[PDB]
Design a protein around this ligand. Structure first.
Ligand code: CLA
Ligand code: CLA
Ligand code: CLA
Ligand code: CLA
Ligand code: CLA
Ligand code: CLA
Ligand code: KC2
Ligand SMILES: CC1=C(C#C/C(C)=C/C=C/C(C)=C/C=C/C=C(C)/C=C/C=C(\C)C#CC2=C(C)C[C@@H](O)CC2(C)C)C(C)(C)C[C@H](O)C1
Ligand SMILES: CC1=C(C#C/C(C)=C/C=C/C(C)=C/C=C/C=C(C)/C=C/C=C(\C)C#CC2=C(C)C[C@@H](O)CC2(C)C)C(C)(C)C[C@H](O)C1
Ligand SMILES: CC1=C(C#C/C(C)=C/C=C/C(C)=C/C=C/C=C(C)/C=C/C=C(C)/C=C/C2=C(C)CCCC2(C)C)C(C)(C)C[C@H](O)C1
Ligand SMILES: CC1=C(C#C/C(C)=C/C=C/C(C)=C/C=C/C=C(C)/C=C/C=C(C)/C=C/C2=C(C)CCCC2(C)C)C(C)(C)C[C@H](O)C1
Lengths: 172, 180, 90
């Protein structure tokens, strides 16, 4: 049985060792696709979403000097349209795409099994040398990223309905 | 055996819960017993929600529904809510939310029925949803067959409540109160 | 006349049994027969609904209904996989 869902059987592909394991896969999507690929994708989705949710709140709180002229009133998805016309979105796309090309090489190494998924050995300031703290930090990353994925969807849909943006909608 | 005139089908196990041996037409032979049991339990739960909803709707209404719904209605309520959703009102999107969440639950409980049919450890009908623990805790009482008896009553009861208000304008509490 | 190459991961799929080995399902080799059968019906109903909603085609078709209409042929392959898995005991 599964720790998350008692009635259903435990997912065969998933194992306890992997971080953020709740034994949750009712539709058994893990069997269909390689688990290492799914782990790498989940981590990537989590980190992009985490940046997105923090950015969504930040744009409400403060805006960088001179941005206000270019973005008249649009927030969230609306700002992208104007900055797409201007050069901001394209320049971000270009540099992220350059990063992703190396990420493609990294993904190949993870799929072959040689490299652990989601690890780019990026620790500029040491936070995970304990080897006990590391696992706790990894679980924190998974849970915070999952919350941010749900949050990013939640906020953008509120913008679709009213155009308020995350903080303004809470005020009114 | 409820009816001695028509025997109980052998395929129906005596041990399984809720068995009165009332299968005069022997429909159990035609279909898988485990699937039939699951269909029964699921039907009882959906019917039980529908019949109480009929009674409660007359006695209490949530604030502000009175504008979006006729004062007394049953299936008319569903049609009224849908009419405003198709119209484009933001507020009357109740039907989509109920449909979406029930559908999502059905989608993620989908493997359970097939897994039991393959002899899986879970028995039919037990999703292990007892947070309070009081009703099904330890030995338990006759509540296991109580759900089945109340559910069967709910099924026919819903049929009665829905069929009335089709030929009449009266609602459940109103029709019980005055009978013409 | 010389060894004919095949991609890595090529396995033998010739069958003379009642149903082919589950390997012929590729990435879907581990999915249950119930899960293909429910996906088969789901894809058939959703695909038929989406197809029906755009039968008079306009210059503005809903792209979700176009994409959802591809579920109808995909459901055929799903019920074939459901028969294969049911006859392999999955
Ligand atoms: C998915 C993430 C995401 C996306 C698509 C956007 C997109 C956008 N933002 Mg938002 N933003 C984000 C995250 C994001 N932001 C984050 C994380 C913050 C800080 C909490 C902000 C704070 C912010 C402000 C204050 C403003 C924008 C603005 C804008 C727009 C113009 C581009 C710009 O100047 O951004 C500039 C954004 C930054 C400089 C913040 C980036 C900081 C993150 C943390 C990058 C970290 C990189 C990391 C250190 C390296 C990791 C390497 C590793 C992968 C190996 C554009 C629509 C502007 C706008 O139009 O507002 C209405 C604006 O004024 N952003
Ligand atoms: C990528 C998004 C973005 C965009 C479209 C702009 C756009 C603009 N900035 Mg810039 N700016 C940005 C990000 C951006 N900024 C970031 C991330 C920083 C660093 C925090 C700055 C720091 C900055 C300074 C310091 C100044 C501008 C200024 C200006 C405006 C000059 C014209 C004007 O207001 O008259 C122009 C519209 C000028 C301005 O008018 O701002 C008050 C100016 O002096 N910008
Ligand atoms: C963790 C993430 C997160 C959080 C904190 C919220 C929180 C919120 N959302 Mg967002 N939302 C999320 C994820 C999230 N949502 C996701 C993943 C979706 C799907 C895309 C949505 C879609 C969504 C819509 C479409 C709407 C909200 C609304 C709301 C608010 C009221 C919820 C309510 O009363 O209904 C819970 C009601 C119940 C009966 C549940 C018990 C609340 C501020 C509503 C709102 O008022 O915002 C304007 C609204 O209209 N959200
Ligand atoms: C099949 C069942 C069913 C259906 C389709 C409807 C449909 C509707 N009802 Mg009715 N209703 C139901 C059951 C049902 N109700 C039940 C069980 C009750 C409580 C006894 C009510 C009480 C009720 C009131 C008081 C009102 C409606 C109203 C409405 C309309 C707007 C939606 C709304 O506010 O509902 C609100 C419904 C609820 C809050 C009931 C939710 C009860 C939940 C399902 C119990 C869950 C218990 C358990 C913890 C869940 C287990 C989960 C497990 C499966 C995993 C809509 C036509 C409104 C209307 O316009 O009427 C004129 C209105 O004012 N309903
Ligand atoms: C849990 C159920 C619930 C609860 C607590 C409320 C609560 C409320 N509704 Mg109601 N409402 C409900 C379900 C519910 N609604 C349903 C299911 C529908 C139909 C889909 C409506 C449709 C509705 C309308 C059309 C309006 C309200 C309004 C209101 C608010 C003012 C009450 C009023 O008009 O007098 C009140 C907070 C009013 C409102 O939004 O006030 C600002 C209003 O005009 N309600
Ligand atoms: C008469 C109603 C009734 C009864 C006796 C039961 C009894 C049972 N159910 Mg079922 N069930 C029902 C309705 C009922 N259910 C409905 C409507 C739903 C859908 C929301 C479910 C969904 C459900 C699931 C998903 C599961 C069960 C399970 C169980 C069992 C263990 C938990 C327990 O002790 O529940 C005790 C429950 C009650 C005593 C119901 C109390 C309801 C109150 C007291 C009265 C009704 C209030 C209602 C809102 C309307 C009020 C009046 C209105 C007209 C104004 C038990 C056999 C679990 C099981 O078999 O595995 C452990 C399980 O997994 N049930
Ligand atoms: C086909 C589905 C169907 C079901 C499952 C069903 C179940 C129940 C239950 C079970 C919970 C009870 C307790 C009950 C009671 C009454 N039913 Mg019945 N009933 C159904 C159908 C009809 C029709 C078509 C009519 C009708 C009637 C009455 C009257 C008479 C009052 C009167 O004489 O006015 C009473 C007391 C007639 C009526 O509505 O008259 C306008 C009439 O037209 N019923 N009914
Ligand atoms: C230091 C450094 C590192 C780093 C790093 C970084 C940049 C780490 C950043 C991590 C971040 C950005 C985490 C942010 C998570 C956001 C969440 C969980 C959202 C919650 C919102 C909710 C629940 C909501 C909501 C809302 C709804 C939906 C609708 C609204 O109308 C209302 C409302 C607002 C209530 C790394 C690890 C790379 C390496 C090294 O160590 C150096
Ligand atoms: C499972 C469980 C949980 C739960 C739960 C829930 C939601 C439990 C709900 C149970 C319910 C809602 C039971 C309702 C049954 C309705 C019946 C029998 C009506 C029959 C109508 C008739 C006979 C009629 C009529 C007539 C009249 C009046 C009107 C006329 O116009 C028509 C007509 C003449 C035919 C909880 C949360 C406790 C946790 C727990 O751990 C597990
Ligand atoms: C379009 C467009 C753009 C854009 C954009 C963006 C940012 C689009 C992003 C859209 C996103 C992130 C949608 C996510 C939706 C999440 C869902 C539906 C999950 C719900 C949870 C469920 C169902 C169940 C949850 C669950 C519960 C309740 C109980 C069970 C357990 C659990 C699973 C936790 C731009 C930027 C180009 C601008 C342009 O001008 C327009
Ligand atoms: C909202 C929506 C709709 C809808 C709808 C709904 C909710 C429709 C529901 C329809 C139902 C439940 C019909 C069943 C009627 C007959 C019954 C229950 C007889 C039971 C007893 C029997 C067979 C005998 C029992 C027995 C007795 C006598 C005792 C002996 C033993 C035994 C032989 C077992 C519409 C249609 C209004 C349209 C609208 O646009 C959208």
């Amino acid at each position: 049985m599964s720790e998350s869902v008692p009635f259903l059987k435990k997912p065969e592909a998933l194992d306890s060792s992997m971080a953020g394991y709740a034994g949750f896969d009712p539709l058994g999507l893990s069997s269909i696709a390689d688990i290492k690929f799914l782990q790498e994708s989940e981590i990537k989705h989590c980190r992009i979403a985490m940046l997105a949710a923090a950015g969504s709140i930040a744009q409400d709180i403060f805006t960088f000097p001179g941005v206000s002229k270019v973005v008249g009133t649009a927030k969230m998805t609306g700002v992208h349209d104007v900055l797409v016309k201007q050069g901001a979105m394209g320049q971000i796309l270009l540099w992220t795409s350059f990063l992703e090309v190396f990420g493609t090489i990294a993904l190949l190494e993870t799929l072959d099994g040689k490299r652990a998924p989601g690890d780019f050995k990026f620790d500029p300031l040491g936070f995970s040398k304990n080897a006990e703290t590391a696992k706790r930090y990894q679980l924190s990353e998974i849970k915070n990223g999952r919350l941010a994925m749900l949050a990013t969807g939640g906020m953008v849909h509120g913008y679709f309905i009213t155009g308020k943006g995350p903080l303004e909608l809470l005020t009114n | 055996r409820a009816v001695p005139f028509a025997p109980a089908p052998d395929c129906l196990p005596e041990n399984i819960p809720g068995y009165m041996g009332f299968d005069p037409l022997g429909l159990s032979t035609l279909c898988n017993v485990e699937w039939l049991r699951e269909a029964e339990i699921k039907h009882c739960r959906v019917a039980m929600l529908a019949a109480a909803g009929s009674i409660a709707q007359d006695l209490y209404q949530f604030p502000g529904v009175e504008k979006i719904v006729g004062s007394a209605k049953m299936t008319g309520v569903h049609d009224k809510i849908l009419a405003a959703a198709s119209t484009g009102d933001y507020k009357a999107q109740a039907m989509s939310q109920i449909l979406f969440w029930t559908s999502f639950l059905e989608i993620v409980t989908l493997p359970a029925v097939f897994e039991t049919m393959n002899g899986g450890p879970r028995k039919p009908g037990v999703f292990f949803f007892d947070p309070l623990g009081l009703g099904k805790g330890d030995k338990m009482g006759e509540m296991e067959l109580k759900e089945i008896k109340n559910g069967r009553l709910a099924m026919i009861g819903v049929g009665g409540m829905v069929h009335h208000y089709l030929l009449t304008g009266k609602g459940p509490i109103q029709f019980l109160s005055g009978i013409p | 006349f010389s060894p004919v190459p095949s991609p890595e991961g090529t396995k033998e799929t010739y069958w003379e049994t009642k149903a082919p080995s589950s390997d012929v399902l590729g990435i879907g080799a581990g999915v249950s027969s119930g899960n293909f059968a429910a996906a088969s019906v789901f894809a058939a109903l959703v695909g038929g609904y989406c197809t029906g909603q755009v039968i008079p085609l306009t210059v503005e078709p809903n792209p979700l209904f176009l994409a959802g209409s591809f579920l109808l042929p995909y459901s055929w392959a799903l019920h074939v996989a459901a028969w294969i898995q049911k006859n392999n005991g999955k």
